[PDB]
């Protein structure tokens, strides 16, 4: 599993093992990659893609954080002009002055804690690391890396993009967060582990009546004897005058 | 960008063509990934349930 355990908490270890039983991380990554490939095949000719490719992926790749590999390979009939790296929410992107024929897509799943639940920073850092890494081999220098935070249900991509891929990837991520089977199973297991389920007309009479009962208010008189300077002259106001 | 509104639709279906519940889709994915399917008794129970559902939906 790709989860790091800061501090020997056997309780949390058992709980996380129960949640991710039966190689759930690998199944989640597999489901995500198949869903993305299906989406790309359903919109193949619209973006000038010759075909998609299922890269041979080592099982550990799903939970391999030190290095990485390729997940999906896109082959083209025409040249793809590529743009400079931008985030998933970067509406304005600057075009790079180069083209390619084979385009790689990588999927990285993470379990972010409270301090490191920023998916965009993680995606950017890991894209700039794996691309310029020596134990990670990419088919092409140009591609996209999508980081998905299962602990907080986030997703962001920072790699190199070509025109027409932005909306496709956006709705692909939307639909895959909305209706992935493996992600739904993860959510259900987490829920089970957490045991959480879903005038001067009538006012004059009132004033007269209140003043009629104001006699009893004189029987209880309180003096706010606090914050007294105790230097000036004291007040000896009599009780009869105050009652009157 | 090029300019389009890609209709990215992802659905789970089976060899019978019926839409699958997320639990059923996950079960199918796990069975295919583990390399081993369900047992004979489970297969017979599933087939009987499917036949009963088809009979009930026919009226």
């Amino acid at each position: 599993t790709g989860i790091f355990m800061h501090g020997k908490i056997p309780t949390l270890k058992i709980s996380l093992i129960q949640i991710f039983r039966a190689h759930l991380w690998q199944k989640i990554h597999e489901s995500i990659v198949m869903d993305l490939c299906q989406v790309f095949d359903q919109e193949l000719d619209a973006l000038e893609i010759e075909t998609v490719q299922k890269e041979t992926i080592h099982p550990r790749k799903s939970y391999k954080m030190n290095s990485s590999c390729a997940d999906i390979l896109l082959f083209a009939s025409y040249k793809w002009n590529v743009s400079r790296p931008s985030l998933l929410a970067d509406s304005k992107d600057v075009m790079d002055s180069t083209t390619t024929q084979k385009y790689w897509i990588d999927i990285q799943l993470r379990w972010g804690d409270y301090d490191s639940h920023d998916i965009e920073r993680y995606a950017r850092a890991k894209f700039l690391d794996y691309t310029t890494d020596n134990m990670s081999i990419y088919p092409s220098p140009t591609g996209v890396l999508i980081a998905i935070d299962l602990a907080y249900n986030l997703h962001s991509a920072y790699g190199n993009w070509f025109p027409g891929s932005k909306p496709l990837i956006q709705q692909a991520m939307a639909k895959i967060m909305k209706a992935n089977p493996a992600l739904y199973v993860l959510r259900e297991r987490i829920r089970k582990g957490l045991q959480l389920y879903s005038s001067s007309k009538t006012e004059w009479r009132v004033r007269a009546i209140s003043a009629a009962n104001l006699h009893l208010r004189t029987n209880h008189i309180y003096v706010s004897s606090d914050d007294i300077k105790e230097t000036g002259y004291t007040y000896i106001l009599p009780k009869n005058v105050l009652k009157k | 960008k090029d300019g389009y509104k890609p209709d990215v639709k992802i659905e789970y279906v089976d060899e019978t063509g019926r839409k699958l519940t997320p639990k059923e889709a996950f079960r199918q994915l796990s069975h295919r990934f583990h390399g081993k399917g369900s047992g004979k008794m489970k297969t017979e129970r599933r087939m009987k349930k499917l036949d009963e559902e088809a009979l009930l939906k026919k009226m």
Binding site: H23, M34, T56, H58, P59 | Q28, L29, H34, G35
Partner: peptide, 18 residues
């Protein structure tokens, strides 16, 4: 498509088949 490749009891190379 919707093909789901095998993880357990493959006996071949570690990486997934195409």
């Amino acid at each position: 498509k919707r093909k789901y490749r095998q993880y357990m009891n493959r006996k071949g190379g570690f990486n997934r088949p195409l």
